[PDB]
Amino acid sequence: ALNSINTNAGAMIALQNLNGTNSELTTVQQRINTGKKIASAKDNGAIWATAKNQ
Amino acid sequence: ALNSINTNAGAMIALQNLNGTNSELTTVQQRINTGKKIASAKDNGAIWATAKNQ
Amino acid sequence: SATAASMNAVKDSLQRGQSTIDVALAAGDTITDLLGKMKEKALAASDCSLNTASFNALKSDFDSLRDQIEKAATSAKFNGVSIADGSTTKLTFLANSDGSGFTVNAKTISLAGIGLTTTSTFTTAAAAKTMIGTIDTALQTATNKLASLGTSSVGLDTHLTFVG
Amino acid sequence: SATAASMNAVKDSLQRGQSTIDVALAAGDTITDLLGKMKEKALAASDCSLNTASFNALKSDFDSLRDQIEKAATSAKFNGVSIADGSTTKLTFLANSDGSGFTVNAKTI
Amino acid sequence: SATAASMNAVKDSLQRGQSTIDVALAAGDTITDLLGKMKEKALAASDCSLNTASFNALKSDFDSLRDQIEKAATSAKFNGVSIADGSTTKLTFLANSDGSGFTVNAKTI
Amino acid sequence: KLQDSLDAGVGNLVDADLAKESAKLQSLQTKQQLGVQALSIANQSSSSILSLF
Amino acid sequence: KLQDSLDAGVGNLVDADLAKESAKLQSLQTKQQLGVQALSIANQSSSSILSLF
C-alpha cells in the first residue's frame, strides 16, 4: 500500500538477488579451488563419468 | 532555479565528463592489449585495409 | 496465509534431503577412487610371469581395497537413513503444500550393489583376467548411479529456490 | 457520494487482480529459465558421437527439467484461481462503479 | 517533455544497431584471416613440379577453409537480423524523435 | 569469439548505468523526506477553529 | 606415448581456464558488495512513518 508497516517487497527482492550472487560466487570459488570445471558429479554427469572411466 | 528539488545540471555534466574519460580509457586499454594503434576496422579503415592486403 | 506457513514447513524437508544426498555423493567419490585402484591391482595380478610371492602381495592389496569399499559404503548415513547402503528402495521428501512428494530413487553403491559380492578374490592368474572385466563393469555402473544422484541433488536445490 | 463508496469497493478487486498476475509472472520467469536449460540439454543429446551412457544421462536431465516445469506451472494459484494453469479462459475484475469490467486473458504456460 | 521521452525511446534502437554491427565485424575479421590462408594454399597448389599426392592435400585444405568461411559468415546474426549474410539490403534504426532514420547498408561477406 | 560477442550484445541491450542511478536515488530520497514534512504541514490545518468557540 | 595422449585428452575435457575465473571472481565480489549495500538501503524504508504520529 506504499506505506505498509507489516511488509515490504523491496527487502525480499534484494535478498533474492543477493542469494543468487552468493550462489554464483560459490560456483566460481569451487572452480578456483579444484582447478577444473567438472569436478564432481553435480557439475556434469556425462562428462564426469567419461573422464573417470578414461 | 538554484534551489530546485527535481533536477540539477551539475550531476548531468559530471556524468558526461566521466563517460568521456571512460571512453578514452577504453581506447588506451585496447591499444595496450593488442599492442598496435590500428587493430580493427573501426580505428582506421584505409590503413587497416592496406596492412591486411600487404 | 495458512498455505504460506505450510510451505515454510516444506523447506525443512527439502534441506534434509539435500544433506542426505551430499553425504551419499562424498561416499561415492571415495568408492570410485578405490575401484580404480582395485582395477589396477587386478590387472597387475594377471601377469603370468610373476612369482608366488608377488601374487600373494597383490591379492592382499586387493582384499584391503575391497574392505575399504565396504567400510566407506556402509557409513554414508544421515539421520539414520541412506540412499547408498541398499536398506531402502527410495526416499520421498515434501515438494508441495498439499502433500505432494519429491522422489529420489536409491542408488546402491555397496559391494553387492555393483556386483562385487563381498569375499570375492582371485586364487590363480586366470581368475584375475576375468576380475579385470568385472571391475570395469563395476566402475561403469557406479559412475552411472553417481551421475543419477547428482541430477537428483540439482533438482532438490532448484525446487528449494522456487519454493522460497 | 454513493458512487464514491462504490469506487472504494472497486479498488479491492483491482488489488486482488494485481496479486494474481504477480504470482503468474514469478512462475513464468522460473519456467523460462528451465526452458533454456532444456534446450541446452536437447542440443547436447543430439551429438552423434556420444556413448550409450551419456545419452541416458542427458535424457534423465531433460526429464527432470520437464517435471520441474510442470510443478512450477501448476502451483501458480492465488485465491484458488490462476491465469497460468489453463483452467479458465479469462479473468474479469471490476473497473468502474457501474459494473464495467477489466479483462485479462489467460496465458497458459 | 514528451519529446525527451521519445528520445529515451530512440537510444534503445541505436544500441541494438551497435550490437548487430559488432557481431558482423567479428565475423568479418575471421573471414579475412581465412581468405589470406586460402590465397596461400592456392598459390602453393599452382606449382607445376608437385606430385599427384600434394595437389590433393592442398585441394582438401582449400575446401576446408572455404567451408569454414561459409560457416562463419552464416552465423553472424543478432536478434535474427544480419548485415553480413545477404538476407536483406539495408537496416534502418531510429535517429530522431520525429521518426527520422539512420541507414546502414548491408555488406555481404 | 562469437559467444563473447553475443554476451556483450545482450549486456549492451539490458544493462543499466549505476552512476546515474546514484544521483537519481539521492534526489528522490531528499524529495520523499520533503514530502513527508509537507504532508505533516498540511495535516495541521483547521486546528485553529477551536479558538473561535 | 599413448598414456601421455590419454592424460592430455582427459585434461582437455575437464580442465578450467583460470584467467577467466579471475575476472569473473572480481566482478562477482564487487556485485556482492553492492548487493549488501542495496539491501541496507531497502531496509531503511518505512522508518519515516513515525514522524506523522
Side-chain angles (χ1 to χ4, degrees):
Chain A
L2 294 89
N3 292 116
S4 183
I5 206 174
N6 300 277
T7 179
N8 56 335
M12 297 176 178
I13 302 180
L15 254 175
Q16 295 175 14
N17 295 271
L18 186 54
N19 291 344
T21 302
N22 286 337
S23 299
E24 297 185 7
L25 247 175
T26 290
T27 294
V28 175
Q29 283 176 4
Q30 177 69 14
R31 271 190 176 98
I32 290 182
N33 297 341
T34 187
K36 52 182 56 177
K37 310 190 204 74
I38 293 93
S40 177
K42 296 185 57 182
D43 300 331
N44 210 327
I47 305 185
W48 175 82
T50 299
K52 275 274 169 295
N53 295 284
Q54 190 57 55
Chain B
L2 294 89
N3 292 116
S4 183
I5 206 174
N6 300 277
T7 179
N8 56 335
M12 297 176 178
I13 302 180
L15 254 176
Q16 295 175 14
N17 295 271
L18 186 54
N19 291 344
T21 302
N22 286 337
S23 299
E24 297 185 7
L25 247 175
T26 290
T27 294
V28 175
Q29 283 176 4
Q30 177 69 14
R31 271 190 176 98
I32 290 182
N33 297 341
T34 187
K36 52 182 57 177
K37 310 190 204 74
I38 293 93
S40 177
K42 296 185 57 182
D43 300 331
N44 210 327
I47 305 185
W48 175 82
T50 299
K52 275 274 169 295
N53 295 284
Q54 190 57 55
Chain C
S1 55
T3 306
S6 302
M7 288 172 192
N8 188 23
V10 170
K11 295 158 72 176
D12 307 7
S13 176
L14 288 177
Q15 295 170 355
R16 199 208 316 141
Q18 284 185 351
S19 301
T20 303
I21 303 203
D22 294 1
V23 180
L25 286 180
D29 198 321
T30 294
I31 290 180
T32 55
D33 204 333
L34 293 168
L35 270 174
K37 290 168 189 169
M38 288 176 61
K39 171 189 174 169
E40 187 173 341
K41 296 295 172 188
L43 172 69
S46 69
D47 195 0
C48 298
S49 60
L50 254 54
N51 320 118
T52 316
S54 313
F55 186 84
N56 300 332
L58 296 165
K59 189 174 180 301
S60 298
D61 285 328
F62 186 91
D63 195 323
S64 165
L65 288 169
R66 168 172 48 81
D67 295 350
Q68 287 281 338
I69 282 191
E70 187 57 42
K71 292 178 193 168
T74 197
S75 302
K77 299 193 311 300
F78 188 87
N79 195 24
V81 303
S82 179
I83 41 185
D85 321 2
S87 55
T88 189
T89 176
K90 60 173 177 293
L91 284 183
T92 306
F93 307 97
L94 290 178
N96 182 231
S97 168
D98 296 65
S100 302
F102 191 100
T103 307
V104 182
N105 294 280
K107 302 299 184 185
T108 306
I109 58 178
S110 63
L111 284 172
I114 60 187
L116 274 183
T117 314
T118 314
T119 71
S120 65
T121 48
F122 36 84
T123 60
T124 64
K129 185 73 176 305
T130 76
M131 206 66 193
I132 299 174
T134 300
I135 298 177
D136 284 6
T137 304
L139 182 54
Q140 289 176 1
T141 195
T143 51
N144 292 5
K145 296 176 169 180
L146 290 179
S148 298
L149 271 185
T151 287
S152 296
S153 191
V154 171
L156 276 165
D157 300 2
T158 294
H159 198 47
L160 183 60
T161 299
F162 169 70
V163 167
Chain D
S1 55
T3 306
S6 302
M7 288 172 192
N8 188 23
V10 170
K11 295 158 72 176
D12 307 7
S13 175
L14 288 177
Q15 295 170 355
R16 198 208 316 141
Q18 284 185 351
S19 301
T20 303
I21 303 203
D22 294 1
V23 180
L25 286 180
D29 198 321
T30 294
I31 290 180
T32 55
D33 204 332
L34 293 168
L35 270 174
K37 290 168 189 169
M38 288 176 61
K39 171 189 174 169
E40 187 173 341
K41 296 295 172 188
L43 172 69
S46 69
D47 195 0
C48 298
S49 60
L50 255 54
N51 320 118
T52 316
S54 313
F55 186 84
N56 300 332
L58 296 165
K59 189 174 180 301
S60 298
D61 285 328
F62 186 91
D63 196 323
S64 165
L65 288 169
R66 168 172 49 80
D67 295 350
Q68 287 281 338
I69 282 191
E70 187 57 42
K71 292 178 193 168
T74 197
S75 302
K77 299 193 311 300
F78 188 87
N79 195 24
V81 304
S82 179
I83 42 185
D85 321 2
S87 55
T88 189
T89 176
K90 60 173 177 293
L91 284 183
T92 306
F93 307 97
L94 290 178
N96 181 231
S97 168
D98 296 65
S100 302
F102 190 100
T103 307
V104 182
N105 294 280
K107 302 299 184 185
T108 306
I109 58 179
Chain E
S1 55
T3 306
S6 302
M7 288 172 192
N8 188 23
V10 170
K11 295 158 72 176
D12 307 7
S13 175
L14 288 177
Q15 295 170 355
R16 199 208 316 141
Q18 284 185 351
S19 301
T20 303
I21 303 203
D22 294 1
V23 180
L25 286 180
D29 198 321
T30 294
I31 290 180
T32 55
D33 204 333
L34 293 168
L35 270 174
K37 290 168 189 169
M38 288 176 61
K39 171 190 174 169
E40 187 173 341
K41 296 295 172 188
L43 172 69
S46 69
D47 195 0
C48 298
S49 60
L50 254 54
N51 320 118
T52 316
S54 313
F55 186 84
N56 299 332
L58 296 165
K59 189 174 180 301
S60 298
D61 285 328
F62 185 91
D63 195 323
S64 165
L65 288 169
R66 168 172 48 81
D67 295 350
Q68 287 281 338
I69 282 191
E70 187 57 42
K71 292 178 193 168
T74 197
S75 302
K77 299 193 311 300
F78 188 87
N79 195 24
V81 303
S82 179
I83 41 185
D85 321 2
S87 55
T88 189
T89 176
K90 60 173 177 293
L91 284 183
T92 305
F93 307 97
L94 290 178
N96 181 231
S97 168
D98 296 65
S100 302
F102 191 100
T103 307
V104 182
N105 294 280
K107 301 299 184 185
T108 306
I109 58 178
Chain F
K1 183 180 179 179
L2 173 68
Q3 184 188 27
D4 286 358
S5 292
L6 294 185
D7 285 354
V10 177
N12 187 31
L13 272 202
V14 297
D15 266 12
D17 189 7
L18 295 180
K20 183 162 55 182
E21 310 304 327
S22 61
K24 190 159 187 55
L25 178 71
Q26 283 286 347
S27 64
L28 284 176
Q29 283 181 337
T30 298
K31 203 179 189 309
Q32 176 186 64
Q33 294 178 10
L34 183 55
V36 177
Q37 184 69 25
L39 179 55
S40 178
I41 293 177
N43 284 340
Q44 79 191 20
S45 171
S46 70
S47 300
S48 302
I49 310 177
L50 304 177
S51 52
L52 295 176
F53 302 93
Chain G
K1 183 180 179 179
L2 173 68
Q3 184 188 27
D4 286 358
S5 292
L6 294 185
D7 285 354
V10 177
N12 187 31
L13 272 202
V14 297
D15 266 12
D17 189 7
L18 295 180
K20 183 162 55 182
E21 310 304 327
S22 61
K24 190 159 187 55
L25 178 71
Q26 283 286 347
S27 64
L28 284 176
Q29 283 181 337
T30 298
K31 203 179 189 309
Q32 176 186 64
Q33 294 178 10
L34 183 55
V36 177
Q37 184 69 25
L39 179 55
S40 178
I41 294 177
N43 284 340
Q44 79 191 20
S45 171
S46 70
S47 300
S48 302
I49 310 177
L50 304 177
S51 51
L52 295 176
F53 302 93

